[PDB]
Symmetry: C2
Subunit: 283 residues, 2 copies
């Protein structure tokens, strides 16, 4: 029997928002200490929760629903302080005309869709007829007045499709900041509690390697954008602005925002309004 | 509609034999120009042949069966000149006692299993009772006199299991070298012909990036083995010896060996004995 140690199974969001991080993991050689899995954020969260991954990114809403079973990594997250550029509401009408209107929710999202619902109800006062469908701006606009998108599809709606076809594109990060003055966190990195307790060292080394890879990705954002632009409708400048508008910090200001968002949606999203976020303790 | 250009879909053998190359692809940043797929060599060959990949490693036997539809990359392959360490025959008896005996063939292999059959029949003169099964030395040894293994399972049989349980482990690379004096090639890198013709630049850049990643992996072999040893029953010295015993060249001497092997097995393995190997041509300037 081969009872040797086994690499941690690590999820990774396939979208552009984590492409610089993937660059960092590869350039540092960290990838060879992972058994990596790429998917969309809702799938990666499902996989970590059910045990098909040991460590990975978790969309915030799904993390809070499973907070007792997850240990969040400090000082890294997928967030924003103001605009996030790639979490948006695309609408053919002003937001105050969406009461009773058909609003499409991209299936790949769990946190942005909930944040959009929070804003429309509690900030703008509209009660739309929501439905979930795969992300597709062309099809969504034919069946609904507005659509909530994340990832590359939202970046394309914001940078390309919206301007071309004269559609309003609302940045969810900006709408949240206007309403609360706070930054926002869409996803955290977490280890399964059972894995963190079985392998405290590997979990710590994975966390430290993510920080080192994130730090390197910030320093070489220009190189990453140049290479990534060759395979996208986006150009180098647009990607570089997107990569640098994204906020990957996860300290006290970011937890402050998580706390307040959890309070406003918790009782209606399946976790206590005062849900406890357990963070990986340093040595 | 997003009509932008799309990354080539590139296969990669998950075994240790291509772990240094994976290190190279990551350190150079090449991975961010690929849409990578990791699997075992027989699966990757099926995927490239059926069109689920654009470029990838192809076990030689499967490449030769589809040679008209594949374009091989020059100057990189998975081969050996003498021992390969991770393509073996594990046997409880001397090889000359395997006539009519049960011999198990690891499912993940296509070329080593054929080479083992060629050697046992044409060099040693035994006609065993072959059967194919998933790679598992413990299960294979209770049901058969000998077993053919590749990859990490063969490296484990050669370095650990064999010595512990007193089993003979024959290196297929060495047996071929003894018989012919030639090196051997187990897998090549190839692009689908339709993809190579639709995207000559991307194919060329992928080829050049593989060479650059391979070269870097050779220079940093010690680092790769140190890191990889932490997740293996093998130690740093064993991995470094394995990485440096592997021969990743694919030039005239290696093509010579491919030609002769194809000649000896072709008519009984589903391709002409004189099958034509088309190589990716470099650009004129
Ligand atoms: C921040 C972005 O989008 C995301 C990322 C992760 C999770 C979610 C979600 O809504 O669950 C959204 C981006 O693409 O920049
Ligand atoms: C060379 C090794 O094994 C291989 C690699 C690729 C294909 C095959 C095959 O037999 O089809 C075997 C090694 O593991 O070092």
């Amino acid at each position: 029997v081969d009872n040797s140690r086994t690499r941690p199974r690590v999820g990774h969001i396939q979208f552009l928002n984590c492409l610089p991080l993937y660059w960092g993991l590869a350039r540092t050689g960290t990838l060879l200490d992972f058994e990596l899995t790429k998917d969309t954020p809702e799938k990666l969260s499902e996989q970590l929760v059910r045990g098909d991954l040991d460590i990975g990114p978790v969309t915030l809403v799904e993390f809070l629903k499973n907070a007792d079973d997850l240990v969040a990594f400090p000082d890294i997250a997928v967030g924003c302080d103001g605009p996030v550029m790639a979490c948006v509401i695309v609408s053919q009408v002003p937001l105050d005309r969406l009461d009773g209107a058909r609003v499409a929710l991209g299936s790949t999202s769990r946190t942005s869709v909930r944040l959009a619902q929070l804003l429309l109800s509690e900030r703008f006062g509209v009660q739309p007829d929501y439905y979930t469908c795969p992300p597709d701006l062309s099809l969504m606009m034919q069946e609904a007045d507005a659509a909530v998108l994340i990832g590359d599809a939202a970046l394309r709606a914001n940078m390309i499709d919206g301007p071309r076809y004269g559609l309003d594109v609302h940045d969810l990060g900006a709408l949240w900041k206007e309403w609360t003055g706070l930054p926002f966190v869409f996803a955290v990195w977490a280890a399964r509690r059972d894995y963190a307790e079985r392998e405290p060292v590997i979990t710590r080394k994975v966390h430290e390697a993510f920080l080192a890879s994130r730090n390197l990705s910030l320093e070489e954002v220009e190189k990453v954008a140049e290479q990534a632009a060759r395979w996208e409708a986006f150009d180098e400048d647009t990607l570089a602005k997107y990569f640098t508008t994204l906020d990957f910090r996860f300290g006290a200001p970011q937890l402050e925002a998580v706390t307040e968002f959890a309070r406003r949606v918790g009782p209606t999203t399946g976790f206590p309004a005062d849900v406890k976020v357990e963070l990986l303790k340093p040595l």
